[PDB]
Ligand binder design. Structure first.
Ligand SMILES: [NH3+]C[C@@](O)(c1ccc(Cl)cc1)c1ccc(-c2cn[nH]c2)cc1
Ligand code: NA
Length: 331
């Protein structure tokens, strides 16, 4: 708890006295889209002076307001510039014009983890274990800031050139969009509009590990309603190739009973770290990035993007009238 005790202090220092790294939008050349979302997209950009590459998130200000995500966006930004953790995406710069918010992020050239997963079918248990370790640490870190990841979106788990995970989200403090739309990853307590705490993240961890090891999520159906029924049921078919160690962990993680769910017990996350499945895991070496990654992305070019999918390229139009000024004044 040495690396996290201080990185909690560092968060508060940076929170309260933010840096003002200065670039201008005009310095970045838009190249191609790395991903799309509800209220924007992430462009790969090249710095016109250095030739260095970044991932620029472009949010339409109006669409953020029309979907009531202002507070979340402002918060997400402030959290992100304040955190320094090895498996969280750094914010480099941020700007705004009339139409858009712009957030220049550190580029993770290895693409989304789940495109490597579809490509190879399923991860081996060491391979899955390697990634899960980073997530555990990331979740432990986020928890020490009273942040909760809540909804796992595995499209948001990126891979860097060293083959380590970069997580793109920072959770929430304290949307039927998410419930109805992305159902496979919801914890039971969220489906049944009960309370939820840090323990939903350990459910998410369970789903993630299962999907990595299996190649598909543990609760799947055609209509979302059936999925909900499965999640709350507390019943999961394990593939036959799952070790009994893995099966055991997943029963404890995918526990519907909050009070018995691993991570949420007396010893907290140490239940998880000291599980037989993680016996071979050097937690310090993972944090310090000294474990050799099982997959290292192939770097064909300087701004090579073949590790991300293709997307249609909208024109980034900018109004000559400032939109949503007061709303994003503090952004
Ligand atoms: N998978 C998440 C999304 O695709 C994304 C796309 C649009 C929006 Cl509004 C939010 C998130 C994404 C893609 C790439 C990156 C990225 C690449 N390098 N560094 C960050 C981050 C998020
Ligand atoms: Na404001």
């Amino acid at each position: 708890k040495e690396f996290l005790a201080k990185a909690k202090e560092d968060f508060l220092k940076k929170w309260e006295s933010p840096a003002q790294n200065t670039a201008h939008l005009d310095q970045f050349e838009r190249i191609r889209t790395l991903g799309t979302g509800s209220f924007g997209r992430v462009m790969l950009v090249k710095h016109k002076e250095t030739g260095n590459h970044y991932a620029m998130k472009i949010l339409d200000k109006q669409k953020v307001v029309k979907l009531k995500q202002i507070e979340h966006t402002l918060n997400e930004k402030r959290i992100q510039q304040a955190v320094n953790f090895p498996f969280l995406v750094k914010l480099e710069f941020s700007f705004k014009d009339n139409s858009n918010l712009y957030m220049v992020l550190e580029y993770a050239p290895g693409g989304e983890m789940f495109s490597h997963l579809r490509r190879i079918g399923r991860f081996s248990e060491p391979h899955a274990r390697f990634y899960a370790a980073q997530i555990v640490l990331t979740f432990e870190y986020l928890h020490s800031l009273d942040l909760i990841y809540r909804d796992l979106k595995p499209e948001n788990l990126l891979i860097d050139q060293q083959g380590y995970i970069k997580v793109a989200d920072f959770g929430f403090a304290k949307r039927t969009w998410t419930l109805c739309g992305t159902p496979e990853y919801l914890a039971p307590e969220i489906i049944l509009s009960k309370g939820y705490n840090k323990a939903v993240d350990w459910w998410a961890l369970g789903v993630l590990i299962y999907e990595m090891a299996a190649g598909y999520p543990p609760f799947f159906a055609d209509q979302p309603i059936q999925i909900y029924e499965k999640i709350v049921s507390g019943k999961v078919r394990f593939p036959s190739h799952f070790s009994s160690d893995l099966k055991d962990l997943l029963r404890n993680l995918l526990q519907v009973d909050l009070t018995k769910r691993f991570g949420n017990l007396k010893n907290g996350v140490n239940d998880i770290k000291n599980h037989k499945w993680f016996a071979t895991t050097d937690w310090i070496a993972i944090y310090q990035r000294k474990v050799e990654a099982p997959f290292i992305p192939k770097f064909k070019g300087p701004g090579d993007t073949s590790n991300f999918d293709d997307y249609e390229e909208e024109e980034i139009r900018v109004s000559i009238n400032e939109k949503c000024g007061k709303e994003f004044s503090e952004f």
